[PDB]
Write a protein that binds this DNA or RNA. Structure first.
Length: 1164
RNA sequence: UGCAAGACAUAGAAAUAACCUGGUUUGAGUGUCUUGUUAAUUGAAAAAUUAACAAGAUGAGUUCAAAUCAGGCUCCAGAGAGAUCCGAACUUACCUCAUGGCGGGCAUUGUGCCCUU
DNA sequence: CAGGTTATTTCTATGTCTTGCA
């Protein structure tokens, strides 16, 4: 019937809506003015969830790896000890709780117990040194524990190299790498020292090496490239081997050991180079692996990492004895408080172990290194300066004092070093135990499989192997006929189709076209797409204000043919040269180029590349399809060239090996933004009868993509026909529609709540809005939704500053600290400003009448409409509705608290299905801060009196507690309640509760009491709002220095009157009905309020205002006046009796606020 | 002037993976000497060791194991076995299951009021 | 419950050369 507009202001925390007519007076239905504010907490990103998910998947893979290793050692372990694995698996439990009653986790056997196993080998790194540097037949358990530690500390997996390169020493390697060919030994110490010094970067190493080797003549560039290969940079072959025809591509290949390994670079250079593949040869790997394992004591690098961290252990012992000597003298008193007491940041805290006198070991959290160093420095202050004190302080500054072995600093260990250690362990133990040599069906050897499990890391493209379709996060495509069989190393290629899995990964990631939303996009390097870019750029190119083909027909074709076939970057000067060459006429050649930025940003690189690939000049259709598929495979597979090589060999047999090598050397990286079908869509028939396409239209005519998609173009009609438009029902937008467009979670919640308000308003009103005014990233998402549900409505974008200019110029103050109405006033102002600006200096636009056609927007005469907006601007009508949500999050803290601190019931046990951790939280610790999801109202009997209680449902029990019977059972057993009768099964967090005539927001729980926040917005006149704005500005960092004495007096008096108004609002108005009012405390504390200075007065005013706001916990820091920082807190007992409470209502509010149900908790 | 489609450059982020260092809890790495009290086996008694306490003194210390959201999935019962992936993100007013209802209306400075169920 | 690394894709600001709509 009538015509109405809806205005919308979205914020990450609040969403405000308003509805108006052409006269800017609000539509009101159900007797309620249709404008309000919906608040919701800022949504949380999936970063923490993703981190925890990858962490738990990593843990699961570690578990299966350890189980496999245990199964491989099980036969010999059981031969020597029946239950070693069970003792390993029952390490947490006390002696009684173990499956078998024993005392210590490892080496239970009599004689060789744990107490002297740790005496023989103080650490694991003492055992591994013994394993790799000895031949004596070791117990299978010792080898198992060494390999177990190696598995539990794998290493970087970031470097490329070979383990065996460390067997040959630096001297022998230098001898083998000194003048290998006919085109160093003396300086075999400084070079190695520079190479193995991690302090200097690669560039510094290269500069020092070039400075110190003093290269011979005629090899300066060759020696520079050799140094680049040595330290590791992208260096071409070039003069390394010195062929004359350097211009050839085979001798211009660039390779760096950082980007690729030797076995991967070799195929790219096999056959091309002379000799037995030759120039650094397996000496950079030695430098990388031996850089970390230096000693700086004898100058000789350690062979294996276990040889280090034993010398570090000895250095720790020497430093500890030095500090003990330095402490026993000069400080006989703080000996007990530092080396035995479990105080803060001392040695016992640095380790987490102490034994004062006979008492049990006190194991606590390990103190950080920084705190321990600070404590050592503080306790060294009492010691007068001496040699030992200076040396200790120098070591502390150097950071190599009292070092531990396992810590945050162990991130430098490469997997190759640990692999070498494992290989040595397995070779030493292989000469005695024969089970480590026996073969398998797949020709394994019981040693190669352990190494495989050590080294097999699932590639990033494969992702998780199994998916039960509970949620879509796996791509691993399994071979036909291969299912329900576990994925391990040595059968990854036989179970997961790696090529198909990578293809699925890339096509799932890649996005759809910007014009055809159902078909996927072409690779950027694809011939069609590159030709599209070049043709577009030629179309935009204009010469002296004329079209490129307007100068003479065939100019654009000539440029596309004879200027781009080279495939290189076409610059402006090259185009000028071509224009001079091809144009016989036009002697003057000062042709000004417009439409390009002096360089053609696109070039037919792929066309030329495939032209040299096939030798022919111009490709045909079959060769074009061949090249298109080759480019698609190279782009999808990317850095993994093995997939491309396999596809080429199994699909295109006519290609030669040199051609395959050339294909593998191409650089096809990124994806485009236009689909394949969009470029070849059949816009119309031509005169000859052949089809025309968008790409062919660019080729022939003089137009770009946007011109080809004009309103009258046949391509536009074909686009509308192909992109079928369905006006989906307003009531069919599930919140998964906005899950495709790449939006952050806060924006997603913004969009969903705002659209819910829109849907409720439109349904209630009856018909779609004529205009929907909205602010100017994620807002565009709702645009789509509007265009998917309300085709008639047109969105009138409003500038961000226009509304604020209206507020300042026409005197409508906004009070961001007072109440939440400013969102609704912002939406209504969006309506009134956007309507005027859509109808039409910037201020002058509001100085006269604005009217277009039959619709009148602004009437300056008598300010009639203006009066209306002002009468609406200050109205306290808006509805404030907080989102009622179940508190989704964690079950409890992710880190277990100590047993001596945990208490039963309040703390979640470690594992509530074992009957061991559940009833023994005081012994095995537990999880703290067990959060709850939602509240429920249950009627029970206490002291033979019928009373009702609101109680919590914890998050870890939400799924099993959503019906009346289940909640009754939960109250009956877990909460120890007699005769429960659950009356309300869902009271979400942040819900409107009417208690004793005052509105509350149920926002948590503190033990036996439930916590509430203020739900009544406080309204004050305009002058008070301006004063509060000044208060907020001054309390933010401004000063009173510029203010005059009269200004100070006026500020003091107006502050006093604002305080009086606030005090009265807490006494005579609704705020007096709150539980534990602050009015008496406001009046009692008023005496000291005047004596306070201006700035602290502003602070206490803002803190007082914090009591009457719905966006913060009701608490004030009135310490500047004399009260505590928790003044005016609201919390009421969870027991609802019939005496203390007059009306205990729950106001279930619809998201728009139009619909609401009041449930009487007392008598439901 | 806004919107948004194409190309380049400069700064970024986020979503999925893969991995590392770990961190937390628990448990293991026998603590040892003197003094006295208490309780034991003796012993008229003396004395005697043993064991738990309350003081004083002294030695060692670097590591390992298990989990690492509660849980969930499958199989035939349980302080199990399989799998190594689902679980900390987005969505949830209320009523009884439809593109339903959540009454007809007046205010909006203190949570009300008229007219019918 | 914190600090790092690797890969892919997408998105966002700003500037540059164009083009079309409301």
């Amino acid at each position: 019937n009538a015509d109405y507009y809806i205005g919308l202001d979205m914020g990450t925390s609040s969403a405000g809506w308003a509805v108006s007519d052409s006269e800017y007076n609000l539509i009101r239905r159900k007797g309620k003015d249709l404008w309000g504010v919906r608040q919701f907490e800022e949504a949380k990103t999936a970063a923490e969830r993703r981190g925890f998910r990858v962490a738990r998947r990593r843990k699961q893979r570690q578990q299966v790896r350890n189980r496999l290793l245990s199964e491989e050692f099980q036969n010999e372990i059981t031969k020597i000890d029946s239950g070693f694995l069970k003792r390993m698996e029952d390490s947490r439990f006390v002696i009684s709780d173990k499956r078998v009653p024993e005392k210590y986790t490892l080496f239970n056997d009599s004689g060789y117990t744990d107490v002297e196993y740790y005496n023989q080998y103080p650490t694991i790194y003492h055992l591994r040194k013994a394993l790799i540097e000895s031949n004596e037949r070791f117990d299978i358990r010792l080898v198992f524990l060494g390999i177990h530690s190696l598995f539990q500390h794998p290493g970087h997996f970031l470097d490329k190299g070979d383990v065996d390169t460390d067997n040959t020493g630096p001297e022998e390697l230098i001898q083998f790498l000194e003048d290998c060919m006919n085109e160093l030994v003396s300086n075999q110490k400084v070079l190695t020292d520079i190479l193995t010094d991690s302090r200097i970067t690669r560039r510094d190493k290269e500069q020092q090496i070039l400075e110190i080797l003093q290269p011979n003549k005629e090899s300066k560039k060759a020696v520079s490239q050799f140094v680049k290969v040595l330290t590791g940079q992208k260096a071409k072959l070039g003069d390394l081997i010195m062929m004359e025809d350097k211009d050839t591509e085979e001798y211009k290949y660039s390779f760096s050991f950082r980007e690729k390994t030797l076995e991967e670079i070799l195929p790219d250079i096999e056959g091309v180079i002379d000799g037995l593949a030759l120039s650094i040869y397996s000496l950079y790997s030695w430098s990388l692996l031996n850089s970390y394992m230096k000693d700086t004591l004898t100058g000789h690098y350690y062979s294996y990492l276990a040889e280090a961290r034993v010398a570090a252990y000895d250095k720790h012992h020497s430093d500890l004895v030095k500090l003990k000597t330095l402490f026993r003298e000069y400080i006989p008193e703080e000996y007990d408080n530092f080396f035995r007491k479990m105080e803060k940041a001392n040695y016992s805290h640095y380790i987490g172990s102490t034994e004062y006198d006979g008492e049990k070991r006190c194991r606590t959290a390990k103190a950080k290194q920084e705190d321990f160093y600070k404590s050592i420095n503080k306790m060294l202050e009492k010691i007068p300066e001496c040699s030992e004190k200076t040396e200790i302080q120098k070591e502390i500054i150097e950071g190599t004092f009292l070092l531990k072995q396992t810590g945050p600093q162990n991130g430098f260990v490469p997997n190759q070093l640990q692999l070498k250690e494992l290989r040595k362990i397995l070779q030493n133990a292989s000469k005695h135990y024969p089970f480590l040599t026996e073969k398998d069906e797949r020709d394994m050897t019981a040693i190669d499989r352990i190494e495989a499990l050590f080294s097999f890391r699932i590639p990033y493209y494969i992702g998780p192997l199994k998916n039960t379709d509970n949620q879509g996060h796996g791509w691993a495509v399994r071979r036909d006929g291969h299912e329900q069989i576990p994925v391990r190393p040595w059968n990854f290629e036989e179970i997961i189709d790696e090529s198909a899995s990578a293809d699925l990964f890339i096509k799932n990631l890649v996005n759809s076209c910007t014009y055809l939303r159902t078909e996927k996009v072409l690779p950027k390097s694809s011939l069609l797409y590159q030709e599209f870019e070049v043709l577009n750029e030629l179309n935009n190119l204009r010469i002296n204000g004329m079209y490129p083909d307007e100068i003479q027909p065939g100019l654009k074709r000539m440029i596309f043919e004879q200027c781009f076939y080279s495939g290189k970057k076409v610059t402006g000067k090259k185009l000028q040269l071509f224009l001079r060459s091809v144009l016989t006429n036009s002697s003057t050649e000062e042709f000004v180029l417009t439409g390009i930025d002096k360089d053609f940003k696109s070039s037919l690189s792929s066309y030329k590349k495939f032209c040299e690939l096939f030798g022919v000049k111009t490709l045909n259709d079959t060769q074009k399809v061949m090249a298109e598929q080759i480019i698609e495979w190279s782009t999808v597979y990317g850095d993994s060239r093995k997939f491309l090589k396999r596809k080429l060999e199994d699909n295109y047999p006519e290609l030669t090996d040199q051609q395959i090598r050339r294909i593998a050397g191409f650089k096809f990286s990124e994806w485009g933004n236009l689909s394949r079908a969009f470029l070849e869509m059949e816009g119309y028939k031509d005169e000859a009868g052949n089809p025309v396409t968008i790409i062919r239209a660019l080729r022939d005519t003089q137009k770009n993509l946007m011109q080809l998609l004009s309103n009258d173009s046949a391509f536009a009609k074909k686009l509308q026909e192909l992109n079928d438009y369905v006006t989906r029902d307003i009531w069919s937008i599930e919140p998964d529609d906005l899950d495709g467009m790449y939006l952050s979670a806060p924006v997603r919640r913004m969009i969903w709540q705002t659209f819910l308000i829109l849907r409720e308003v439109v349904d209630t009103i009856g018909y779609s809005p004529k205009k929907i005014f909205m602010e100017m990233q994620g807002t565009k998402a709702i645009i789509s939704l509007i265009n998917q549900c309300f085709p008639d409505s047109e969105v009138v974008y409003v500038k961000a500053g226009n509304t604020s200019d209206f507020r300042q110029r026409f005197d409508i103050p906004k009070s961001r600290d007072l109440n939440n109405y400013h969102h609704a006033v912002d939406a209504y102002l969006n309506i009134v400003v956007g309507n005027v600006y859509d109808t039409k200096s910037l201020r002058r636009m509001y100085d006269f009448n604005v009217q277009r056609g039959d619709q009148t927007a602004w009437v300056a005469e008598n300010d009639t409409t203006l009066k209306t907006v002002k009468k609406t601007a200050f109205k306290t009508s808006p509805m404030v509705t907080k989102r009622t949500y179940e508190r989704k999050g964690g079950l409890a803290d992710s880190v277990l608290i100590a047993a001596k601190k945990a208490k039963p019931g309040v703390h979640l046990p470690v594992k509530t299905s074992d009957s061991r951790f559940a009833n023994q939280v005081s012994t095995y610790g537990g999880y703290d801060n067990v959060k709850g999801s939602h509240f429920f109202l249950v009627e029970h009997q206490q002291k033979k009196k019928t009373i009702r209680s609101i109680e919590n449902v914890p998050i870890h029990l939400k799924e099993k507690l959503k019906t009346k019977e289940e909640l009754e059972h939960y109250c009956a057993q877990v909460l120890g309640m007699v005769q429960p009768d659950v009356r309300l099964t869902r009271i979400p967090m942040y819900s409107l509760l009417l208690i004793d005539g005052y509105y509350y927001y149920l926002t948590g729980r503190t033990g036996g009491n439930l916590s509430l926040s203020n739900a009544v917005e406080l309204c004050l006149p305009a002058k008070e709002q301006a004063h509060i704005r000044m208060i907020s500005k001054i309390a933010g960092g401004r000063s009173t220095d510029a203010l005059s004495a009269e200004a100070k007096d006026d500020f003091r008096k107006k502050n006093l009157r604002l305080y009086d108004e606030l005090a009265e609002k807490h006494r005579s108005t609704i705020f007096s009905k709150r539980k534990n009012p602050i009015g008496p405390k406001l009046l009692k504390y008023r005496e000291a309020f005047v004596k306070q200075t201006i700035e602290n007065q502003c602070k206490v005013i803002l803190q007082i205002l914090k009591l009457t706001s719905t966006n913060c916990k009701t608490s004030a820091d009135l310490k500047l006046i004399g009260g505590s920082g928790q003044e005016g807190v609201m919390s009421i007992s969870k027991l609802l009796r019939a005496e203390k409470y007059a009306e205990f209502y729950l106001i279930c509010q619809s998201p728009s606020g139009i619909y609401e149900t009041r449930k009487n908790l007392l008598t439901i």
